A paper describes a structure:
The conserved shelterin complex caps chromosome ends to protect telomeres and regulate telomere replication. In fission yeast Schizosaccharomyces pombe, shelterin consists of telomeric single- and double-stranded DNA-binding modules Pot1-Tpz1 and Taz1-Rap1 connected by Poz1, and a specific component Ccq1. Here, we report the crystal structures of Pot1DBD-single-stranded-DNA, Pot1372-555-Tpz1185-212 and Tpz1425-470-Ccq1123-439 complexes and propose an integrated model depicting the assembly mechanism of the shelterin complex at telomeres. Overall, our findings provide valuable structural information regarding interactions within fission yeast shelterin complex at 3’ ss telomeric overhang.
After an extensive screening of deletion mutations, we identified a construct of Ccq1123-439 with a deletion of residues 199–215 (Ccq1123-439 Δ199–215), which could form a stable binary complex with Tpz1425-470 and produce high-quality crystals for structural studies. We determined the Tpz1CBM-Ccq1TAD complex structure by the SAD method at a resolution of 2.4 Å. The Tpz1CBM-Ccq1TAD complex structure reveals a 2:2 stoichiometry and buries a total of ~2,100 Å2 surface area in the complex. The Tpz1CBM-Ccq1TAD complex exhibits a butterfly-shaped architecture with two Ccq1TAD molecules as the ‘wings’ and Tpz1CBM as the ‘antenna’. The two Tpz1CBM polypeptides adopt symmetric conformations and each Tpz1CBM contains an N-terminal loop and a C-terminal helix, which respectively interact with the two Ccq1TBM molecules in the heterotetamer complex. In the center of the Tpz1CBM-Ccq1TAD complex, the two Ccq1TAD molecules mediate a dimeric contact in a head-to-head fashion, burying ~500 Å2 surface area between the two monomers. In the Tpz1CBM-Ccq1TAD complex, the N-terminal loop of Tpz1CBM adopts an extended conformation, meandering in a shallow, acidic groove formed by helices α2 and α10 as well as the C-terminal end of one Ccq1TAD molecule, primarily stabilized by a panel of electrostatic and hydrogen-bonding interactions. The Tpz1CBM polypeptide makes a sharp turn at Asp438 and Tyr439 so that the C-terminal helix makes direct contacts with the other Ccq1TAD monomer in the complex. The hydrophobic portion of the amphipathic helix of Tpz1CBM fits into a long groove formed by helices α1, α3 and α4 of Ccq1TAD through extensive hydrophobic contacts. Collectively, we conclude that hydrophobic contacts at the interface are the major driving force underlying the Ccq1-Tpz1 interaction.
Author numbering:
A (entry chain D): 427 to 462
B (entry chain A): 132 to 198, 216 to 273, 281 to 367, 394 to 439
C (entry chain B): 132 to 198, 216 to 273, 281 to 367, 396 to 439
D (entry chain C): 429 to 466
Write the structure that this text describes.
């Protein structure tokens, strides 16, 4: 049976942004080894 | 009639709860924010079980054989039970029934209480305290009709409460519940009133939020003070009106649905 | 008719593919081992799109802008296109249409081929290569009916291929496809065949499994480009197509 | 559908849970030892 959703269980959890972040984080940290 | 004893979780238990929610982060977020498939729900049941286990004793995730009497270090529940009988002394003479939803812990508790000179022993289909595995509840119900003149009941864990309440007819005796503060036990307590469509979602959500009291010394102090108070209370004819413990704080504001 | 050009992924791409699958591990495992709900499927779409983006170019995940010439460093697709037209020389006189499913990369590609004195330009509506965005395909179709006498087609990415192939009628000139080995592009290629219900599960499963060298990458790509150029010069003979087909990935299927 | 193979060979949700929870238990033991010495 259907429910009304008030709130997130894990407030800081954001699946989409975490992906964006980690992929970009990897990219720039690869550029570190380009310098090094 | 049914009274709650709020006991704090150890640093270990909190870490484990934090690790658990983290490991289930995707699954919890999915389940708690919309309709989910059968297999998601299956995985949430494992989350709930694990949370129950941590709330029973963290050493359920110890791989190795350990020396009984290692255990009260990380369980406010074990310490509570120790300090209760310590301050209850040989004067008091009512027979306790304790329900616990784990065979290993039943054995460890039973053996550890004996170790501290407490007349405790396992139930099976007169002592200072019976230790009963919640699986073997169908037998004890018969004997919880005769000794209502003098038989008090302790639920070590909420899982045992859930199990025993549903199977057996409602018990005519004093019921004490050991409920860990901030655990799934606390969450189940606050949403007991419902058991509707949003029950699972809410208890998971609250636990998730809480895991996204203080240190060892302070826990021990609080546990003893709670134990002294309850013992004192039992000595004085178990007055409903002079129950000394505050109730568990309400977590309904941390709900995620309905 | 469609001739595939398998190109190797850079170290960066493989890392990003490894990170991607790791980030989606629970979701991939759930999706690919049993029935799943609408919302799982929706999240899988994001995994698939990320995989395409990595296969297009890793710099789609660059936070800041950057100047051309930096891009070929990490894309064998860019390198391939440089070496093709380098070795193709001013002798060859047939016009290429490259299709790509990203505006930024289309601009970047054109401005880098212009950098290496290759007669390339963005398609608005004759030069050496027209860099066309896949969204703007419905226009090119009309003009891929008149120049079949002399117009070859390169698909930079599989999205570009799928979008243009359907939206337009059957292109009856030469079709080249740039496909990254072991990427989601490879996977889609292998499971195209069926057009059925185990499709998503298989491409995700295969890519998940495969994601669980600099100078040599440069060499191979150079060799491939030289071979294709040589092949184009000699009147694009069917029986002498120099590149091996993409290896079959059916053995890595997770379902059906 | 019929599911003949796992997409991520080394991945096991249910098993990794036991592992990580047990792994945390032993981390605490080390911390407990370190406290007792120092």
């Amino acid at each position: 049976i259907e429910l009304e959703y008030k709130r997130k269980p894990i407030p800081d959890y954001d699946f989409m942004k975490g992906l964006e972040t980690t992929l970009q984080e990897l990219y720039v940290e690869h550029q570190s080894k380009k310098r090094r | 009639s049914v009274l709650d004893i709020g006991l704090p979780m150890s640093a270990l238990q909190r870490k484990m709860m934090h690790r658990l929610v983290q490991y289930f982060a995707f699954c919890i977020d999915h389940f708690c924010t919309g309709p989910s498939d059968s297999r998601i729900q299956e995985k949430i049941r494992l989350f709930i079980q694990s949370a129950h286990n941590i709330a029973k004793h963290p050493s359920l995730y110890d791989t190795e054989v350990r020396n009984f009497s290692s255990y009260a270090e990380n369980s406010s529940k074990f310490l509570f039970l120790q300090e209760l009988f310590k301050n209850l002394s040989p004067s008091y003479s009512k027979t306790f029934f304790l329900f616990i939803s784990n065979q290993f812990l039943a054995n460890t508790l039973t053996q550890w209480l004996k170790s501290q000179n407490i007349d405790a022993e396992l139930w099976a289909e007169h002592p200072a305290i019976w230790i009963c595995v919640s699986k073997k509840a169908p037998s004890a119900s018969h004997f919880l009709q005769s000794c209502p003149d003098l038989s008090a009941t302790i639920f070590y864990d909420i899982e045992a409460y859930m199990s025993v309440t549903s199977s057996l007819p409602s018990i005519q005796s004093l019921v004490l519940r050991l409920i860990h503060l901030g655990s799934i036990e606390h969450a189940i307590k606050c949403f007991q009133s419902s058991y509707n469509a949003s029950f699972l979602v809410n208890i998971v959500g609250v636990v998730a939020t809480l895991s996204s009291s203080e240190s060892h010394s302070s826990i021990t102090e609080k546990t003893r003070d709670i134990a002294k108070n309850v013992a004192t209370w039992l000595k004085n004819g178990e007055n409903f009106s002079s129950w000394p413990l505050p109730p568990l704080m309400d977590l309904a504001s941390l709900s995620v649905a309905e």
